[PDB]
Design a protein around this ligand. Structure first.
Ligand SMILES: *CC(=O)NCC1CCN(C(=O)[C@]2(Oc3ccccc3)CC[C@H](N)CC2)CC1
Ligand SMILES: *CC(=O)NCC1CCN(C(=O)[C@]2(Oc3ccccc3)CC[C@H](N)CC2)CC1
Ligand SMILES: [Mg+2]
Ligand SMILES: [Mg+2]
Ligand SMILES: [Mg+2]
Ligand SMILES: [Mg+2]
Ligand SMILES: [Mg+2]
Ligand SMILES: [Mg+2]
Lengths: 5, 236, 236, 5
């Protein structure tokens, strides 16, 4: 899963 | 409703204690109460609100993914029929997740966004709006999936337009917005090329502005730039 | 009440799904529903019940300890007065913890223990009774603290007496009971010598019986024996 | 904190 903030 | 009798400052104090205790549901409830006092939120307070709900919904999303995977396996050829329970329990988690998203969206609509005039506050809230529509989109399978996706896109786009006009390319809010909108493109909108272009352009424009920054601002911006690079590496 | 309309088997199925999803509150609610069907629990089902509530109360205890530490620091000389919020929020967490303990104790009293005739089931439940009174004792500060402590002690002692008569010294339930009763002595009863003696004797008597075991039983018993050694190392 | 099971 890709990085989000 | 439940927090109506508690002072705003006490709600904020308790949200911070709840964070220290890793009690994120409590933290979110305190911050909801604080928002419902009706006053604008400071930067620190906006970050408390975001951390609380990110952690609550993050846990629901992870649970939903576990359950959806079990459910998909149940629908493969040669899988034994186990009854309605997996679907029911995935639906239960899903409904709870949707409820949290609706709560956040509700706070933004009543009345955080409309009172947010400064670029940093308005972009922050519009990013949140995009994010919680994105979480709704992750679980959407019916007649409104397109409209949910478009609601996320519209919120992110408004945030992007403001951030490009009003904030430097290293601003952590602008970077985080771009990071998340890029993930929206890749994971939700079936637009991996747009995702990759956005991440790359965002990274490169930030790189070019690092020279203007203090040591501490440099640290903050480079952290998120590394997330952009991490995604680019995953995708290329 | 809420689970009254759901089949027993469906509650058990869902508890297992909740475990996979790390949804321990849901898992505990499902298992409470299953107990309230009124039938005895199998070994697997007893373990689902214990895992669920251990994880729920474990999280509450960790939160309580964070908050109690902040509160104790607030009461030191030279600490600035910050109002009632820390105490209030510690009390909130505490009350919730007490509620979970009371729920578990209630299931044991109505009617798990009284229907449990086999040594393995009866010892398992009495260990649980000791454990949840121990959690109550951790937070007790008033007129009933002694009685709560004695309730834990009595439950553990009954379990110990049955386990010594009816189970081999390597039995994982007997070992886990001894491990926890030893911690009760050290942390609750102000009896570190008793704690150390119990752990040592339990370890040594188990060691002497390992030769009787299969590979898989050996693995199960040695795991808990290592916990006994770990505590002994912490305490000596 | 000591180990319990
Ligand atoms: C009021 C305000 O300026 N908020 C922005 C903060 C900028 C620094 N932060 C972060 O970098 C993290 O969270 C983000 C949320 C939204 C947009 C960008 C970042 C929090 C720490 C993490 N290690 C990185 C992301 C906090 C918000
Ligand atoms: C029905 C039954 O026989 N239950 C006992 C199991 C024995 C093996 N287990 C364990 O070792 C763990 O949990 C315990 C609970 C109560 C008493 C002793 C153990 C679960 C796995 C851990 N790695 C070690 C403890 C499960 C219960
Ligand atoms: Mg007031
Ligand atoms: Mg649904
Ligand atoms: Mg462009
Ligand atoms: Mg039935
Ligand atoms: Mg109290
Ligand atoms: Mg003795």
């Amino acid at each position: 899963f890709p990085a989000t903030v | 409703g439940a927090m109506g009798s508690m002072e705003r400052a006490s709600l904020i104090q308790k949200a911070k204690l709840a964070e220290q205790a890793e009690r994120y549901e409590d933290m979110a409830a305190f911050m909801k109460g604080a928002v419902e006092k009706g006053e604008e939120l400071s930067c620190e307070e906006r970050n408390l609100l975001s951390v609380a709900y990110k952690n609550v919904v993050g846990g629901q999303r992870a649970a939903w993914r576990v359950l959806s995977s079990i459910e998909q396996k149940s629908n493969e050829e040669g899988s034994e029929e186990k009854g309605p329970e997996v679907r029911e329990y995935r639906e239960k988690v899903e409904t709870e997740l949707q409820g949290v998203c609706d709560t956040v969206l509700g706070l933004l609509d009543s009345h955080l966004i409309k009172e947010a005039g400064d670029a940093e506050s308005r972009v922050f809230y519009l990013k949140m709006k995009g994010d919680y529509y994105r979480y709704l989109a992750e679980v959407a399978t019916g007649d409104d999936k397109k409209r949910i996706i478009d609601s996320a896109r519209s919120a992110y786009q408004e945030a992007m337009d403001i951030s490009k006009k009003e904030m430097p390319p290293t601003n952590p809010i602008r970077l985080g917005l771009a990071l998340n909108f890029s993930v929206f493109h890749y994971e939700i909108a079936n637009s991996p090329e747009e995702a990759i272009s956005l991440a790359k352009t965002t990274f490169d424009e930030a790189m070019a502005d690092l020279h203007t920054l203090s040591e501490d601002s440099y640290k903050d911006s480079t952290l998120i730039m590394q997330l952009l690079r991490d995604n680019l590496t995953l995708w290329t």
